[PDB]
Write a protein that binds this ligand. Structure first.
Ligand SMILES: [Mg+2]
Ligand SMILES: [Mg+2]
Lengths: 390, 406, 51, 107, 107, 254, 219, 219, 94
RNA sequence: UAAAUUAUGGUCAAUUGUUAGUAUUCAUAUUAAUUUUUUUAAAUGUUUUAUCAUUUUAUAAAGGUUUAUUUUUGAAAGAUUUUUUGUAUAAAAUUUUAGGAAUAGUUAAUAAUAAUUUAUAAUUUUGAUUAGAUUGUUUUGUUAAUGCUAUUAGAUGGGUGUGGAAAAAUAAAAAAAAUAAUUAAUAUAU
């Protein structure tokens, strides 16, 4: 539990504390074992996990992050229970073994449903068909795999969940020897996550798990990493990243728009990042949680023309081929379509070369939340706009 | 009746009060003192169904009834639910924890905008669990989990728990003991009316007064402190004593016909599992003497010697003179490991009580057997030798004025 | 009724109430004179007795 | 130190007392005279008890005679009431002439 | 527990004893048992600044606060009543010496 | 206000030290009723276990200013009838006051004289009892009375007990509660020990003898012929007016 | 059938006293008022009784009743009625005693309206922090004085202007110029010189003599 | 007060509080001071016989009752009777002494915790390895630990006159038992209460009989 | 009222007049009262010798009488071994 | 100021008496009479004891007049435990006068039981004190009625400091320490 002197960890101390050497670590087996240990808990195991000697705002943000981890793990618990119930129902209605259900086919489903309908059991045939239909979308062993890995990385990030996975009294299944196990599969799994997934903090912040600082610094590190693999000759001074090829490849970290947006002020246009790629200019803006501030956060057409004219003045690029385009990002997370549009527009990367440069992009399945409709309307009116030519 | 100890807890929840941890502790201890172990487990299930996370004192009070009932499954369930994250004290950590939870208060804003269920404070026992685990009673947990695995018959889990407890009591500092709580009673500050009958108020007998004990004690006391006030080596001695006491308890449970006063022929002779039991006890005593070096000269081993004599009297059928010889050899071994000329201690009243009960177990008999009026004795029983060994021992106890008879 | 009486409000019309008294007097208090529905159970004992 | 404790039931002043904070309005001369003259009469009465025993003994003796021989010295519900002319107001006209009115405070 | 309250005389009597117990300690500071003692001093000082204070009691309070090294929680009302005590007619150079030595040992 | 600090429950009461009906006077036989069973148990203790400061070689020499403060509550035994100075000797010759030493003089050492010593300031009594040896109780060699010549021998046998009390106090004052340690007597067990030659002369009885004849019957119960007070099982009278329990009635006329 | 509360109250009265109520309590009796005193010579100074006055605390007309639905029941969850209260500090002339004016609601069902009445309480503050003008939250407690059974639990809003006026050496609240009079007679302020006070005294005593002449009546 | 302006005030109670948590910067967690005792308990006045300076429920123990103790055991030279004669043996008295205590306080703790009439019979002196100890020095000045062997050398010609005015269980909160007769480290934490008597509810509040209509639960 | 009568009779230990005792003996709650006399059968005559002979002819065991008193007075729901084997946890926690 | 869009390719209704409950008679209903009925005349036996005594036996009426109410730790219940110890003395709240003004054994503090002191004290025009009337009480009556109109549970600072508690100068039961009687009805006159 929480002790006097426990502290929340950043990525550096998670990397340093869980730095062990492992060879051929099973991701799915240790993932299922750690989640089986998690699902066997009660709600009282989640109570005393906040470290006491902290200010109240930091304790509130830690409580919000732990509540988010708890509700996402409970959602995956009920999803896994539904998965096991559907697999057991299919193996009981059909008569096939349980381990070969996941490798079955749709022709096999048609044959088994026709066999059940021939015997006169239309209810069991409808149950088998509906269980297989809701099993084709959820039945993979790696379904929410990046989200579950980010949940376990967040449980390591809290710092108070590391001793909750060991010192259990178990029985041997074949000899019935009551013993106490000191093996910690959570530490081995977090060590393998830190060793293999070098950008697990970027996926952790992009999925909306970080409640303290958000995903903006992870976005800057992601864009700097994607600039270092495309320009390949990169100098980085403070908040300015530049390629030295003569062709303009510039990333400028202007300001943080969460503190820059004064509530009750009349100032049109506050951006976060400015990316100059060749002749193109992108104003990368992270939207705010205030819907009365999103209309003030995007710059005017005259302001974008002034920024493009300043680019023509400073970089010496002629104003015949100069294009400037706004880019709006979701406030608390970063969905898959936003990252795809960021790779398409800013860095001029298609899907195949982005999957070659970034391996974890294919299994990233974050989408826009349905309850935020005004942001989706603003992003539809913003991202479908033509490049403003000076 | 003892069932009322279960009743007044239940009426505590029917009348919409939150039972604190002291109520569960008092209910489990009152039902354990009356021999109602299932009612104590019902109190534990009541605490679990109220979704109250127990403190270490409630955990120890549950593990006492898990130890006395000999049920390892209950203790393993309680371990895997609550005690998997209990750590021993470290030299770097502070010995008392500071109070983390500020008492509940509302500002001038939170009185208005918060709803009435957020501004409501009942004495919820889950709020002060981090402040009731302030004094690090983990050594009382790892001892209790060492005992119940001895009761269920698990040697490897007992060896793991006892090895962890031994390494913690040899290489980690002693925690600060929790002070007693005087706010749990509503006793008056003084006697409101001063009036005291004399000891000789009755001309027919000597009666006890409220001022002084004039009739003498009926039962000998051990005259030792509580287990929380002990040091780490003293708690290791107490741990060996408790493991031997649970060995004695499980031997009396497995063989109830051969452990009481006679009532049958089988009391006189050893059981067939007594040699391995005494071998395990001797190996535990030699492990205690090998772990602690000269420091065992500066520790109180009165209850340890009394439990050693009770084990080598009940489990091993030994004579009272053999028990006196073993106690004298134990005290001379303790006085000899100090590497000085020293001066040996005397046997206490609890140590002499085991020798006298061994003398009574030598001369014990089966009264009114099948021959209608013939008491059956032990084979090879000599009344003259046993009486001669009793009389000089009684004179030895009476020569020492520091042993209080009972 | 005050002391020893379970009546909480007038039967038909009342002075204007605010807050939880407004929600209680109009929606949430007991009413055994309702011929259609009995006074409701707490959650979740109302879902399984819907019919 | 402006909010009382809901858990322990302490007052507004006792929470600030346990925090080492001082909330006291600037007093006038009479409000400081009320708090400064409490010790002066105690030192005067102790000096009278030490310096004139033959008068203090007679004063304490006649005070004990007036206390002991009184009619309403038995602790009862009437003697234990905080406001006797307000609780027992039907005696003030026809039976008790000590109190001429039944209202002395906001109750 | 609120059963009693300390005036300035009790503080001026308790502060040299606690300074002596600080000097007799192995460490320079006192043990943590007396944190409720100094707090009982800390509420007694800031209330007494709202009452009347003679010059000798203020000098004994300043010397006691300088003897055992404790900064009171108020620290401004004490300096405000020390400002009012400089230009008094009863002020002596011994009084100014004690006041300046105590303020240099505190500040 | 001052009236609303506490309630009037449990007020301050007058102590028993200032009430004449609660204070035992030493000129009465009731003084020797309370203090004589304390002496007969202390001599049982001193004859069976070593009491540290119960026997001295002289009277304890406190100064005259510390005489009233330290001496009441103190007891010691000396050899011979030597009385302390600055006292007025008053010999107890009342048979009503001397009757309470009957168990002390019969079952233990014979009481020769009981004296009450009253000083010049009349504030520190001394109850002096002179015994004549030897003891009727067996005395242990490790006991305190083995170091006394008047107790060990069977003028030279006289030894005196000295108990200092305050004159007009309740009987709580003249109590000796620190001497009620019950030390055993090993006189029946000294026969079978290794230190005696009688250890081989006794014969053990391991079985009960076969009884051919039953017990002798009681004589024929004759009921009383006088008027009885009533049923003692409902008048709350103990089984003879002496001891027992009312619920277990026995020893009366029926 | 669903019985009302009067059936339960009748059941309680039957189980207590053996019977509910003896009949014939109305009797339609003609209560006649017989006057004794003169026309305008009733022996009272304020209220002159000349009709049959009804007697009853809660059974009189027009009917009142306490209205438990107010700000206090909306804010505080109370163990009993009147335990927690919120009011304003109006008087600090007593040591360790703040006078707190609080409001409650009384319901008239005939006119169907609630009215706000005011009750003054004496509360306790040990450190003397309550200034006249503070919105305070007081709570019930033991008997402290003859009229003190409340204490200041929290100061929900301090009077900043009162504290700044107390820092200036002034009163916290400037005192009112109006208040209670001393008599029904018009209290005229006398402004005269030091020499013209005897004739003013003669006029005042002559006016008192004419007020005593009013006892004579006609002529 | 006017209750209809409550909810808008709640908006202000929101709009200030969210303004507060964003305005100030929290430096760090302030340590928790122990709460005192209130003199404002509900109900009637209690007696001075039961005033234990605690009028609420606190399930935890704070810092003024926490003591740092050392289990110091001190040896005494005794003599036991054997069949030959006297033999010199050792009797150990164990106390819990505080770490910052002096040796005279350790001697007083040995005097008050022996509970034997044969041990503290005369004035003794504490020593280590024959070298006598200064009674005005701390235990830390001599390096006295649990394993340090401390002897008590007596002078049997004197007589120890003690006056036990301090109770055996004296803590800071001043709660002492009169019939305690035991060191507080020896007695158990929880035991069966034989002095009290179990009492059940004999006064029904609203329900008294035949039919439970409402039960008069508001009362 | 059966439950209130048993509460005031056992827990609170009320008194009983003879007419409510006879009325409750008609209900099977109590035995017939002391005053309900069969006037054809006289009162018994006791002698201790015949009582001792009947007591020594057939007296119960000590442990059987103790367990009967424990079932009648202390509690009557004592769990069997087959129920203790069901109340204990299983292999995921055991 | 959008300008009459064209398979009109689906008409055949309603009523089978089954109801989400304050409903209004300016002349009818409540009061006394055309009719009431039936009795009652005081002057009195509670009991056990250890005997000129002691143990148990705590709310009769008129008068005077009240904004409000309840619970003894003590006696009993009551137990093979025991301290005259088992939290009773408190709060909110709501009265009336056809000719409306002042009130006080007084308010708070207090090292103050049992107040030689301090204070710019306390109640009241948001209706006080006194005087009058006066037990209160969704229990009564009436009506379509959140209206009007009635009431009879009670308590009792100088009779005795006894008793746990004054409630004590008189009550058809509340059966009051051995089963007095316990089938029934009158249960009282007698
Ligand atoms: Mg009783
Ligand atoms: Mg004063």
């Amino acid at each position: 539990h929480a002790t006097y002197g426990a502290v929340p960890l950043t990525h550096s101390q998670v990397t340093s504390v869980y730095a062990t050497d492992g060879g051929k670590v099973d991701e799915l087996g240790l993932l299922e074992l750690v989640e089986e240990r998690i699902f066997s808990w009660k709600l009282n195991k989640w109570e005393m996990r906040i470290p006491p000697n902290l200010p109240n705002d930091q304790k509130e943000l830690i409580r919000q992050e732990q509540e988010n981890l708890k509700q996402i793990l409970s959602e995956w618990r009920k999803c896994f229970g539904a998965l096991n119930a559907d697999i057991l129902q299919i193996s009981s209605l059909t008569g096939v073994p349980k381990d070969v259900v996941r490798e079955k086919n749709r022709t096999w489903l048609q044959e088994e449903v026709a066999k059940l309908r021939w015997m006169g059991e239309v209810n069991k045939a409808a149950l088998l068909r509906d269980a297989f239909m809701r099993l084709e979308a959820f039945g993979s062993r790696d379904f929410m795999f990046m989200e579950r890995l980010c949940c376990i990385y967040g449980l390591a990030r809290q710092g108070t969940f590391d001793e909750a996975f060991t010192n259990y009294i178990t029985e041997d299944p074949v000899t019935n020897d009551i013993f106490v196990d000191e093996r910690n599969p959570f530490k081995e799994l977090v060590a393998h996550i830190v060793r293999n997934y070098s950008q697990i903090d970027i996926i952790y912040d992009f999925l909306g798990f970080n409640y303290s600082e958000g995903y903006r610094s992870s976005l800057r590190r992601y864009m700097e990493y994607l600039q270092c693999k495309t320009a390949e000759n990169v100098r980085a001074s403070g908040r300015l990243v530049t390629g030295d090829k003569g062709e303009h490849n510039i990333l400028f970290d202007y300001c943080v728009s969460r503190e820059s947006l004064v509530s009750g002020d009349s100032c049109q246009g506050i951006i976060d990042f400015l990316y100059i790629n060749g002749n193109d200019v992108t104003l990368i803006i992270i939207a705010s949680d205030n819907p009365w501030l999103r209309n003030r956060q995007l710059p005017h057409r005259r302001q974008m023309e002034g920024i493009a004219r300043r680019v023509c003045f400073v970089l010496g690029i002629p104003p015949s081929e100069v294009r400037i385009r706004n880019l709006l990002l979701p406030p608390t997370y970063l969905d898959k379509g936003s990252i795809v549009r960021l790779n398409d527009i800013v860095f001029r990367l298609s899907n195949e070369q982005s999957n070659l440069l970034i391996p974890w992009l294919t299994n990233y399945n974050k989408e826009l939340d349905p309850k935020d409709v005004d942001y989706t309307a603003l992003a539809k009116t913003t991202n479908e706009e033509e490049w403003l030519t000076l | 009746i003892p069932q009322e100890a279960l009743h007044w807890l239940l009426r505590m929840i029917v009348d919409n009060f939150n039972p604190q941890h002291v109520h569960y502790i008092a209910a489990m201890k009152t039902l354990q003192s009356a021999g109602e172990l299932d009612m104590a487990r019902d109190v534990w299930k009541i605490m679990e169904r109220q979704q109250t996370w127990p403190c270490t004192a409630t955990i120890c009070a549950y593990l006492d009834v898990c130890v006395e009932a000999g049920e390892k499954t209950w203790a393993m369930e309680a371990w895997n639910r609550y005690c998997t994250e209990l750590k021993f004290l470290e030299p770097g950590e502070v010995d008392p924890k500071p109070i983390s939870r500020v008492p509940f208060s509302l500002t001038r804003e939170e009185l208005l905008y918060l709803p009435k269920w957020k501004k409501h404070f009942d004495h919820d026992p889950n709020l002060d669990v981090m402040d009731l685990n302030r004094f690090n009673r983990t050594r009382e947990v790892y001892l209790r989990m060492a005992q119940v695995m001895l009761a269920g018959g698990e040697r490897n889990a007992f060896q793991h728990f006892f090895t962890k407890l031994e390494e913690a009591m040899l290489n980690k500092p002693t925690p600060v003991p929790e002070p007693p709580n005087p706010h749990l009673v509503r006793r008056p500050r003084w006697a409101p009316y001063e009036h005291c009958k004399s000891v000789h108020h009755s001309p027919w007998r000597l009666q006890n007064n409220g001022r002084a004990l004039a009739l003498g004690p009926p039962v000998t006391i051990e005259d030792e402190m509580q287990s929380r006030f002990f040091s780490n080596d003293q708690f290791l001695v107490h741990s060996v004593k408790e493991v031997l006491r649970i060995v004695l308890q499980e031997h009396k449970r497995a063989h109830p016909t051969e452990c009481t006063r006679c009532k049958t022929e089988a009391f006189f002779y050893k059981t067939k599992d007594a040699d391995e039991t005494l071998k395990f006890c001797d190996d535990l005593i030699e492990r205690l003497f090998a772990s602690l070096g000269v420091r065992l000269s500066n520790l109180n081993t009165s209850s340890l010697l009394s439990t050693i004599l009770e084990v080598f009297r009940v489990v091993g059928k030994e004579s009272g003179a053999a028990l006196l010889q073993r106690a004298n050899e134990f005290l001379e071994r303790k006085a000899s490991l100090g590497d000085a000329e020293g001066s040996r201690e005397n046997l206490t009243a609890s140590n002499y009580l085991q020798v006298l009960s061994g003398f009574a177990d030598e001369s014990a008999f089966v009264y009114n057997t099948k021959k209608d009026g013939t008491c059956q004795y032990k084979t090879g029983f000599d009344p003259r030798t046993t009486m001669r060994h009793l009389a000089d021992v009684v004179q030895e106890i009476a020569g020492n004025p520091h042993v209080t008879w009972a | 009724g005050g002391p020893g009486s379970p009546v909480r409000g007038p039967g038909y019309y009342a002075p204007p109430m605010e807050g939880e008294h407004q929600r209680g007097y109009t929606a949430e208090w007991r009413d055994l004179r309702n011929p259609m529905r009995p006074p409701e159970f707490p959650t979740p004992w109302e879902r399984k007795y819907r019919q | 130190g402006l909010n009382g404790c809901v858990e322990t039931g302490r007052s507004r002043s006792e929470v600030a007392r346990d925090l080492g904070l001082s909330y006291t309005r600037p007093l006038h001369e009479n409000e400081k005279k009320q708090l400064s003259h409490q010790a002066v009469y105690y030192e005067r009465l102790a000096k009278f008890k030490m310096e004139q025993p033959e008068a203090a003994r007679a004063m304490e003796r006649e005070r004990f005679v007036r206390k002991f021989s009184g009619m309403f010295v038995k602790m009862d519900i009437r003697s234990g009431a905080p406001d006797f002319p307000s609780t027992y107001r039907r005696l003030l006209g026809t039976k008790v002439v000590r109190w001429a009115s039944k209202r002395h405070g906001p109750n | 527990a609120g059963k009693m309250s300390l005036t300035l005389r009790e503080v001026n009597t308790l502060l040299p004893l606690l300074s002596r117990m600080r000097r007799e300690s192995p460490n320079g500071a006192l043990d943590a048992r007396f944190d409720r003692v100094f707090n009982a001093i800390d509420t007694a000082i800031g209330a007494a600044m709202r009452h009347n204070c003679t010059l000798d009691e203020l000098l004994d309070l300043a010397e006691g606060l300088a003897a055992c090294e404790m900064v009171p929680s108020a620290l401004k009302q004490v300096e405000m009543v020390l400002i009012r005590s400089v230009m008094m007619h009863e002020c002596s150079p011994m009084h100014l010496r004690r006041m300046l030595q105590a303020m240099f040992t505190l500040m | 206000s001052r009236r609303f600090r506490y309630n009037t429950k449990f007020p301050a009461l007058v102590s028993y030290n200032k009430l004449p009906w609660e204070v035992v006077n030493h000129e009465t036989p009731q003084f020797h009723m309370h203090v004589a069973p304390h002496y007969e148990q202390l001599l049982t203790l001193a004859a069976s276990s070593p009491v540290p400061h119960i026997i001295g070689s002289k009277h304890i020499d406190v100064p005259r200013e510390h005489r009233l403060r330290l001496l009441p509550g103190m007891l010691y035994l000396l050899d011979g009838d030597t009385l302390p100075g600055e006292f007025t000797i008053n010999r107890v010759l009342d048979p009503t006051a001397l009757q309470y030493y009957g168990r002390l003089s019969s079952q233990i050492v014979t009481v020769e004289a009981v004296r009450m010593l009253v000083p010049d300031d009349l504030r520190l009594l001394c109850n002096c009892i002179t015994f004549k040896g030897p003891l009727h109780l067996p005395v242990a060699p490790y006991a305190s009375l083995a170091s006394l010549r008047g107790a060990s021998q069977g003028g030279s046998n006289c030894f005196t007990l000295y108990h200092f009390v305050r004159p007009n106090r309740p009987p709580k004052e003249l109590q000796l509660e620190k001497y009620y340690i019950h030390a055993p007597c090993v006189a029946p067990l000294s026969e079978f020990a290794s230190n005696s030659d009688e250890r081989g002369n006794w014969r053990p009885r391991l079985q009960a003898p076969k009884r051919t004849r039953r017990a002798t019957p009681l004589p024929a119960y004759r009921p009383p012929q006088s008027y009885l007070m009533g049923l003692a099982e409902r008048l709350a009278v103990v089984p003879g007016g002496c001891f027992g329990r009312r619920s277990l009635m026995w020893g009366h006329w029926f | 059938p669903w019985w009302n509360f009067q059936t339960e109250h009748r059941q309680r009265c039957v189980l207590m006293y053996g019977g509910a109520r003896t009949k014939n309590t109305h009797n339609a009796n003609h209560r006649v008022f017989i006057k004794k005193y003169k026309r305008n010579a009733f022996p009272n100074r304020t209220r002159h009784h000349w009709a049959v006055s009804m007697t009853g605390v809660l059974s009189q007309r027009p009917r009142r009743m306490p209205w438990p639905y107010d700000l206090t029941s909306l804010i505080f969850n109370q163990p009993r009625q009147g335990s927690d209260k919120i009011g304003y500090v109006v008087g600090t002339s007593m040591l360790k005693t703040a006078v707190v004016a609080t409001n409650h609601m009384v319901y008239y069902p005939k006119f169907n309206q609630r009215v706000s009445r005011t009750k003054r309480f004496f509360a306790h503050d040990e450190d003397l922090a309550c200034v006249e003008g503070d919105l305070v939250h007081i709570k019930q407690c033991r008997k402290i004085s003859k009229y003190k059974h409340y204490y200041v639990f929290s100061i929900l809003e301090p009077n900043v202007e009162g504290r700044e006026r107390l820092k200036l050496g002034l009163k916290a609240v400037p005192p009112p110029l109006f208040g209670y009079p001393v008599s029904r007679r018009i209290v005229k302020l006398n402004l005269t010189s030091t020499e013209g006070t005897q004739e003013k005294l003669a006029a005042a005593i002559q006016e008192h003599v004419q007020d005593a002449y009013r006892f004579s009546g006609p002529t | 007060l006017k209750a209809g302006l409550l909810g808008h005030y709640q908006q202000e109670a929101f709009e200030a509080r969210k303004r507060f948590e964003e305005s100030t910067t929290y430096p760090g967690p302030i340590r928790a001071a122990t709460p005192g005792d209130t003199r404002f308990y509900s109900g009637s006045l209690e007696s001075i016989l039961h005033d234990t300076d605690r009028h609420y429920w606190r399930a935890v123990t704070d810092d003024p009752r926490v003591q740092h103790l050392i289990p110091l055991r001190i040896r005494f030279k005794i003599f036991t009777w054997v069949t030959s004669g006297w033999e010199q043996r050792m009797q150990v008295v164990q106390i819990m002494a505080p770490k910052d205590s002096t040796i005279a306080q350790v001697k007083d703790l040995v005097i008050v915790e022996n509970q034997s009439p044969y041990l503290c019979v005369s004035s003794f002196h504490l020593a280590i390895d024959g070298k006598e100890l200064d009674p005005q020095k701390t235990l830390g000045e001599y390096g006295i630990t649990e394993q340090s062997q401390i002897d008590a050398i007596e002078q049997n010609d004197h007589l120890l006159h003690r006056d036990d005015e301090r109770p055996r269980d004296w803590t800071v909160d001043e709660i002492t038992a009169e019939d305690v007769k035991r060191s507080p480290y020896k007695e158990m934490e929880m035991q069966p209460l034989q002095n009290l008597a179990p009492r059940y509810e004999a006064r029904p509040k609203g329900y008294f009989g035949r039919t439970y209509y409402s039960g008069m639960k508001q009362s | 009222d059966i439950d209130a009568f048993k509460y005031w009779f056992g827990v609170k230990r009320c008194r009983l007049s003879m007419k409510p005792w006879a009325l409750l003996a008609k209900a099977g709650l109590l035995p017939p009262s002391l005053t309900q006399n069969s006037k054809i059968m006289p009162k018994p005559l006791f002698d201790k010798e015949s009582l001792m002979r009947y007591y020594l002819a057939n007296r119960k065991d000590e442990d059987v009488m103790a367990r009967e008193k424990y079932l009648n007075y202390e509690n009557s729901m004592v769990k069997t071994e087959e129920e203790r084997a069901a109340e204990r946890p299983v292999a995921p926690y055991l």
